[PDB]
Amino acid sequence: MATDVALETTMGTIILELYNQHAPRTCENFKTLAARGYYDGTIFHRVIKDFMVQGGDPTGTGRGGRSIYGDTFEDEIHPGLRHTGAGILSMANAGPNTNGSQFFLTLAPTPWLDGKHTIFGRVKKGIRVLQRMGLVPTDADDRPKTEIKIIRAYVVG
Amino acid sequence: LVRRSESLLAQPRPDWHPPWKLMRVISGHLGWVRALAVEPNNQWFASGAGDRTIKIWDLASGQLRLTLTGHISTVRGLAVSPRHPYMFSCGEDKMVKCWDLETNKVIRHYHGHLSGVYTLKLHPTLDVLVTGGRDGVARVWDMRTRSNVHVLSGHTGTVADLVCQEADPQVITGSLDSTVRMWDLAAGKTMGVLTHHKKGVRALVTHPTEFTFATASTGSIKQWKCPEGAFMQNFEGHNAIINTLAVNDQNVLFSGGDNGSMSFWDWKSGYRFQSLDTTAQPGSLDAELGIMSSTFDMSGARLITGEADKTIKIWKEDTTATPETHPIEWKPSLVRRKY
Amino acid sequence: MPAITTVHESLPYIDPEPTPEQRAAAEALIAEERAKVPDDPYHALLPPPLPPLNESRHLTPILQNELARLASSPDPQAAKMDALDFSRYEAPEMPSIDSSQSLEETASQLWETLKQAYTAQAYLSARRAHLALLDTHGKNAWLIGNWHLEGEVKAVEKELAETKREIDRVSLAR
Amino acid sequence: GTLDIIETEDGEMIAVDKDGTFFSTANATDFAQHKPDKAAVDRLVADLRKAEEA
Amino acid sequence: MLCALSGEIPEEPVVSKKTGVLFEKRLILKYLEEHNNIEPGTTEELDPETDLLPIKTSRVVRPRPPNFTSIPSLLKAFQDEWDALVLETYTTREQLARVREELATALYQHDAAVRVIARLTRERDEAREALARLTVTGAAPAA
Amino acid sequence: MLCALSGEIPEEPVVSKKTGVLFEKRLILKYLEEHNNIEPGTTEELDPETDLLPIKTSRVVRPRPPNFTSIPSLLKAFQDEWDALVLETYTTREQL
Amino acid sequence: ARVREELATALYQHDAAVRVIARLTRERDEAREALARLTVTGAA
Amino acid sequence: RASEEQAIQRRLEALRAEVAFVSTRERKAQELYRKLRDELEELRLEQA
Amino acid sequence: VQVDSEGKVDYTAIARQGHSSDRIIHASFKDLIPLRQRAEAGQIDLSRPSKEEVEATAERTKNALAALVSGALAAQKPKNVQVNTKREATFVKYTPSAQMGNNTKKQERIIKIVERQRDPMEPPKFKHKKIPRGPPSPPPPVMH
């Protein structure tokens, strides 16, 4: 079964399916952080054309993380899931197991992050929103000149 | 559809103000009186007219203390400094003069306006004077060095009014191109443009205690809230070219209309508690009925108006008036009020 | 308000959690201290005991007798009192008028049966009127009752949530 | 997946919209992606030229 | 809302002018008469004629079940409710007695724990004072 | 029990010190602001801080729902039935 | 309700006293062991 | 929480007193070591 | 293409095009409604700023205008001879990037920058060019 989370962006709506039977702990971390309003009001801090749309920082910098298991938790790479196209939801870290509260939508097939980040979902509905997210002017450090603020992300049901 | 507020508290109930009546009419000027400036100690006031003289009158007696010459065209601005013994005149002859009141002589010139100058304001805390004219430019001048430190450009018509306040927006220029510009004084840049008026903006005023201002063009007065310039309300019912505007410390807006008309409004509610029509000095034409300049004294108890029949009219509020003799005729109407 | 004012140097959030053997040793020491001196039934911290049924200012003598009857039952949860005569409200059958029965006795039995039948008919008419009123106003009555019950449950849940939030805030500060 | 086809209890095909992108193309960011055909553009140019000749 | 005295909807709800607790008027009058004009749960004195303000509102419509549409059914329901109330009062009294006994046992255990903790603290303080004042004497070898 | 203006069950009921009408706190504040501290249905002034007394509900006793199985509800139903029967008997006796 | 509140307060106080007694016993045992080791060793 | 705050204040005062006593003992030991070093230097000067 | 809170295509990117974020631009019908009647509007604070903010703004604006007065006084009457022999050097730590093909990491540089000694007798070197005015700032919507 896949459970749904709704990103209400200032570009459109993104409905994400979440894979409980393949990477559980990341999925209830995402559900608990979304339903609590923690991802309500943050930014999509990094956008790289043909690589990435990455967000989830409470500070909008690249260091914030408030996972429900304390401050961080471990990795859950399952080799059945690999970064294989546009629109895959994965949990991003910095080196070894440092999973906080930053999520990572792959915008293109990136078969070099396998085993380093926890694939735990997929864009189900609204891939055009993510395509328009990728095609934004970003200035120097992959932060867009405009703001791609997230407002709501709910379990719907 | 944009939602409205149905609380019936969006319309303040007007406070009662007594009506105003004519007290005095001072002759002697041989041109239309277009300037007026009460000195900070409320003893004398300064009228500039179309006969290019500046006359200093005692406020209590209406009695001619002095006449100053030196302009060659109509005097449009006048300002007695609260921190310096200086008076500031501008004219239609492109001249911005600083008079030393200890010698009654012009001691400084602020040159650079390409056409006649219509307005002139002293900054309340800084040592700065601000002029605007027919060249579409608000010049910001330093008092000491006579240096034109800012050229405020962006209007496409004659800058007809201007206010200086101690907080941003520090300059507000209304122009005959129907726009109002809110200016940050430190950079010389337009903070905002208001394009709600359809015709040339001729009158501006700021409230003494609230952080709001008012603009006025023909048939329309608009009240705005600083520093974002959000539209607060309309003053409606004065169907004339409005040359002037005078709010009191007791919240009175005075609009004088070029056809000789007058409206006294309550500031908070927008209610017109008085609607008068001035009378011409004998010998005048019907076309010479018009309030061309106005001000309040520092007490707020007298309204000084300079009128196009070359006169000075003092107006007092009626001391024999009570809320029963002049009841407020305002009711909270339930109308869409198509905006 | 609690009357416990004793101060013990305990830091549950700071000091390490004691082992089960240490807890058993502490319990043994507490039991030894309890066996060292007798307990005081007149302690100031202990509240006064409950008064008797006859000494209660709010309990009536009939209520005291009912409480004594309930306490005398071996199962107070299943202690059901004797029901009233509900067989008189049923349909009265035809009495067996014997041939040797007198005319006066048969007339009295018929009058008693007619009175029982009239009482049953009056009860049935009252039940029919109540059923008509129920069919008239039952949706409104059920909606009002459900709304009141939902409001009471929501108020109780809000009070419990506020108490839990206050307890969590106090625990976090401590 | 934006529009949902349901055969209801009355046996009629209903089409409910999750968003409001179908009715008016507000909330539909692909309003820029509409491309008018040759005939409509020719009709518009012909009508403008007819106004010019008038 | 519910009455503080009984936990049900009061027929004549009245609120204290100082405490703000709503209760039935007859129940509040009986409590004031039994406790000498004292509000229940508080040590303050409540005036039954001055400190009580009645609440004027619409009457609460109780939901009438269709089964209790007859006089004998209503009488049986009233008898069952009275028996349930008596059983609940008896169970509450038994639970209060058990809670009082448990509280007395807990108070005795707490006094014992306080005495044992005082003795252990005295022993630990004596040991700490001995260790702190342990002056290192000359460790002479056994000649 | 319901609010005088809102008409629903108030989570924070407040009673007027002059009229005793129960209402919602926000509704009473809005009505006092709109009508210049005037209680609804009364021409006398009502102070928002002094004339409004909040209602506090104590949960010490067990909650009894207002159903037909309640003892006070059964007593009220029996009293109403007895009053109706007495009125019907009086009317029937007068007619007879 | 008063008896239940008093019983809960007494249970919390008893748990705190048990923890304090365990900590005091551990500290006293550590102090006694340190004193015994210092007496046995002699050289500091 | 009230009991824990009172016990934390009392234990902080007791720990401060114990640390002050330990620091006083360390200062006395340092003074004794300095006096012993001075006496040893005086004895070495007298013997030489 | 952005969306607003309730969800519609946001058209305020056209009115705000060419302007900074601190610019106040009225571009919707909501700006034509009085503030008191403007839906989500309860208490409105209509008080002047306090003396602290007033004096802070006075200090900032008078420092900027004092810099302008200094520039205007320098331009109005030059100081006869325009030389300055107090030519204090400025040191710059310059870390080069990779350029013109090769990508080897060059050593970072310490650069001494000194004003050049100018002939006191030299007249102004270049003529003044009369360039026509640039276009104005993008005009706001007309809110009649």
Report which secondary-structure segment, H or E, holds A110: none
Q: Which of G3, G12, G19 sits opposite C47 (nearest CB)?
A: G3
A99 - beta bridge partners? A73
Q: Which residues of I26-37 are buried (b: 16+ CB within 10 A; e: fewer)?
A: beeeebebbbbb
Cα(B48)–Cα(E116) distance, integer angstroms:
99
Distance from CA of I105 to the nearest CA of D (A): 46
CB-CB neighbors (< 8 A) of C14 in chain H: 8
Distance, in Å, from the CA atom of B79 to the CA atom of B306, rounded to the nearest integer, reads 15
How far is A38 from A101, CA to CA, in rounded Å? 9
CA distance F27 to C79: 50
- Give whole-number Cα distances, C120 to C86, C128, C150, C163, in Å: 11, 12, 39, 54
Assess contact for B120 and B78: CB atoms under 8 A.
Answer: yes
Alpha-carbon dihedral angle through residues A30, A35, A37, A40, given to the nearest 10 degrees? 60
Q: Largest alpha-carbon pair distance within chain D? A: 59
CA–CA distance, I110 with I60 (Å, rounded to integer): 35
Give the DSSP letter string of B280-328: PPTT--GGG--EEEEEE-SSSSEEEEEETTTEEEEEEE-TT--TTTS--
Strand-strand pairing, F22-24 and B252-257:
unpaired
Contact with chain F for residue B103, Cβ under 8 A: no
The one-letter amino acid at B238? H
Separation of alpha carbons A93 and E71, rounded Å:
74
Q: Which residues of C touch F64 (CB under 8 A)?
A: none
CB count in 10 Å sphere of residue C18: 19
Quote the minimal CA–CA distance from F34 to chain B in Å: 6
Q: Are I49 and B210 in contact (CB under 8 A)?
A: no
Q: Is F86 helix (H, G, I), strand (E, B) or coil?
A: helix
Q: How far apart are CA E62 and CA F88, in angstroms?
A: 24
Residue B108 in contact with residue B141, Cβ under 8 Å?
A: no
| Chain D neighbors of I4, CB-CB under 8 A | none
Neighbouring subunits of F (3+ Cβ pairs under 8 A): B, C, E
Angle between helices H2-47 and G2-41 (to 10 degrees): 20
Q: Which amino acid is at I53?
A: E
Catalytic residues of A: 46, 51, 54, 93, 104, 113, 117
Q: Which residues of I82-106 are buried (b: 16+ CB within 10 A; e: fewer)?
A: eeeeeeeeeeeeeeeeeeeeeeeee
Question: What is d(CA B321, CA B264) in angstroms, rounded to the nearest whole number?
Answer: 15
| Interaxial angle between packed helices E71-132 and C103-173, expressed in degrees from 0 to 180 and rounded to the nearest 10 | 30
Strands B212-217 and B220-225: antiparallel
Contact assignment for C25 to G25 by CB distance below 8 Å:
yes
Chain C partners within 8 Å of H2 (Cβ): none
The residue whose two tokens read 């409509």 is D40
- Name the structure determination technique: cryo-EM
Contact between B62 and B83 under an 8 Å Cβ cutoff? The reply is no
C8: helix, strand or coil: coil
CA distances in angstroms from I23 to A57, B194, B204, B214, F69, listed in the order given? 28, 12, 22, 20, 69
Distance CA B45, CA B304 (A): 9
Structure tokens that stand for B296 in this block: 């309040």
DSSP string, E89-133: HHHHHHHHHHHHHHHHHHHHHHHHHHHHHHHHHHHHHHHHHHHHT
C-alpha A127/C-alpha A134 separation (Å) is 11
With contacts defined as CB-CB under 8 Å, which chain A residues touch I5?
151
- Two tokens at A23? 């990477």
Report how far residue I140's alpha carbon sits from residue A58's, in angstroms, rounded to the nearest whole number: 35
- Cβ under 8 Å to A: I residues 9-38: 10
DSSP letters for B74-143: -EEE--B-SSSSEEEEEETTS-EEEEETTTTEEEEE----SS-EEEEEE-SSSSEEEEEETTS-EEEEET
Between strands A2-9 and B189-194, the pairing is unpaired
8-state DSSP, A129: H
Residues 1-54 of D with CB under 8 A from A: 1-2, 19, 27, 29-30
SS3 labels along I33-77: CCCCCCCCCCCCCCCCCCHHHHHHHHHHHHHHHHHHHHHHHHHHC
* Cis preceding linkage at B169, omega within 30: yes
Task: Pick F71's closest partner by Cβ from E1, E56, E82.
Answer: E82
Nearest residue to G7 via CA among F58, E96, E41: E96
Chains that touch G (3 or more CB pairs under 8 A): C, E, H
Establish how many alpha carbons lie within 13 A of residue F50's alpha carbon, considering only the half-sphere containing its beta carbon: 6
* Cβ within 8 Å, pair H22-E132: yes
- Least CB-CB distance to D29: which of A124, A125, A132? A132
* H or E element at residue C62: helix C61-72
Structure tokens at D53: 């000749």
Nearest-by-CA chain H residue for G20: H7
Q: Which residue has the tokens 């294989």?
A: A84
Residue G17 and residue E113 in contact, taking contact as beta carbons nearer than 8 Å: yes
State the number of CA atoms in the 13 A half-sphere of B129 facing the CB.
29
G23 contacts H11 by C-beta, under 8 angstroms: no
Backbone angles phi, psi at B292, to 5 degrees: -100, -30
Whether the Cβ atoms of residue B139 and residue B132 lie closer than 8 Å to each other: yes
The yes-or-no reply on I/G contact (3 CB pairs or more, < 8 Å) is no
Is G9 at the interface with chain H, CB within 8 A?
no
Task: Enter the tokens of residue C93.
Answer: 């059958």
Residues A12, A125 contacting (CB under 8 angstroms)? no
> From CA G18, how far away is CA F94, in angstroms rounded?
82
